[PDB]
Design a protein around this ligand. Structure first.
Ligand SMILES: [Cl-]
Lengths: 217, 217
């Protein structure tokens, strides 16, 4: 059974730098190894096939090497546009299932930029929503870097652990920042039990956690 | 030089899944077709491929419950039974890929969801801008697209006339089994009151279109 181990899980480099991704195969697959690039919201696109041969129009700053068991992809001249996920896959398959067109786990290429703290906005639930019996409080962390960031909700200074949903965009190909949406969902009744609703935010670009809050009303 | 999947959507856990990949642009003979899938937020997973040879190759996990057929009048098919709510929910891709030639393209993908739940249209709630959503010159507003099923839902602003500043986040699956989505945009705060901001939501599975006006509060 064929297994494709892709290391590392994540790598970051500045603009103009170099990035290396390594890939291992269970047993030798000769040179039947393809490298793919997958940008947010897009079908993967093949950069390299037969381990080292570049696809049409692909710049020579993508370099594939290796044979038998151990392969490498190196990307030089990093651009903000190369913020993507990169996959190896075997192009050798059998019927008996010794070989297969198996994909590596993937490597995320992070384009290193200067640290930026989120802008924090908070939105009380809408009157039209409360008429249906639900209250959703949204906290929005906009244009920050790097992606690590924790949000904590406090109702009347009581930590809410279990009724939040976080969601995050992928790295932006223009400003190389992230955005994050957190949503606190309550029944209309439980929402009208308290007055102070607050999200605390912790991020490396801020020296202390910051709280944006509001009083229901 | 194009491929397109079809016949996706909501499937019941006992159901049998059937997709079709229509290749229009190249003679099917002597061109391998692969089926890859991607669970939301996860890596690529190869299902199987049917060579130009005519032979058929399967990943070990799909070999017992999957058949790939071709009807060489521009057609190839994937049947999968034992539909597992958990595992089989994902985006399914078909790709023309040559292990040895520079011929390779993927389709856009088609959503497949396995669930005993049924289709529900979305509710669109405003994220009105206010002082808790302003930062001097900038103000945030948006849409909460709540409680719909299955994916997906597309979100525009002023019928596509607003794209810079727009962040549409990946949908999240709630404790209720429904999806929720948030779309936000930073606009000039002085522009509020004179410039109108309309959220265009399309949810083709339930064939609904909504246009909520996002007004200040
Ligand atoms: Cl795989």
């Amino acid at each position: 059974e064929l297994d494709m181990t892709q290391t590392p899980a994540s790598v970051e480099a500045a603009v103009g730098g170099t990035v290396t991704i390594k890939c291992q195969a269970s047993q030798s697959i000769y040179s039947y190894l393809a490298w793919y690039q997958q940008e947010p919201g897009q079908p993967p696109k093949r950069l390299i096939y037969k381990a080292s041969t570049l696809a049409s129009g692909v710049p020579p700053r993508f370099k594939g090497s290796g044979s038998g068991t151990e392969f490498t992809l190196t990307i030089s001249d990093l651009e903000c546009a190369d913020a993507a996920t990169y996959y190896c896959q075997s192009n050798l398959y059998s019927i008996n299932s010794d070989y297969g067109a198996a994909f590596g786990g993937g490597t995320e290429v992070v384009v290193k930029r200067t640290v930026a703290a989120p802008s924090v906005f908070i939105f009380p639930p809408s009157d039209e929503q409360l008429k249906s019996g639900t209250a959703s409080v949204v906290c929005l962390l906009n244009n920050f870097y790097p992606r690590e960031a924790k949000v904590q909700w406090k109702v009347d200074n009581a930590l809410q652990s279990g009724n939040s949903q976080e969601s995050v965009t992928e790295q932006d190909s223009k400003d190389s920042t992230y955005s994050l949406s957190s949503t606190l969902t309550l029944s209309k009744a439980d929402y009208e039990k308290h007055k102070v609703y607050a999200c605390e935010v912790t991020h490396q670009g801020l020296s202390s956690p910051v709280t944006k809050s509001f009083n229901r009303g | 030089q194009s491929v397109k999947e079809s016949e996706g959507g909501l499937f019941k856990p006992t159901d049998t899944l059937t997709l079709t990949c229509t290749v229009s642009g190249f003679s099917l003979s002597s061109n391998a077709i692969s089926w890859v899938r991607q669970a939301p937020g996860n890596g690529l997973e190869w299902i199987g491929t049917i060579g130009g040879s005519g032979n058929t190759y399967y990943a070990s996990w799909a070999k017992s419950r999957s058949t790939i057929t071709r009807n060489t009048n521009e057609n190839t098919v994937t049947l999968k039974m034992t539909s597992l709510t958990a595992a089989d929910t994902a985006t399914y891709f078909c790709a023309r890929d040559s292990a040895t030639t520079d011929s390779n393209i993927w389709g856009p993908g088609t959503l497949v969801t396995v669930s005993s739940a049924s289709t529900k249209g979305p509710s669109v709630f405003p994220l009105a801008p206010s002082s808790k959503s302003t930062s001097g010159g900038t103000a945030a507003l948006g849409c909460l697209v709540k409680d719909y099923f299955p994916e997906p839902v597309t979100v525009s602003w002023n019928s596509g006339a607003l794209t810079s500043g727009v962040h549409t986040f990946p949908a999240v699956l709630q404790s209720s089994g429904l999806y929720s989505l948030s779309s936000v945009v930073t606009v000039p705060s002085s522009s509020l009151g004179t410039q109108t901001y309309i959220c265009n939501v399309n949810h083709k599975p339930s064939n609904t279109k909504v246009d909520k006006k996002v007004e200040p509060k």
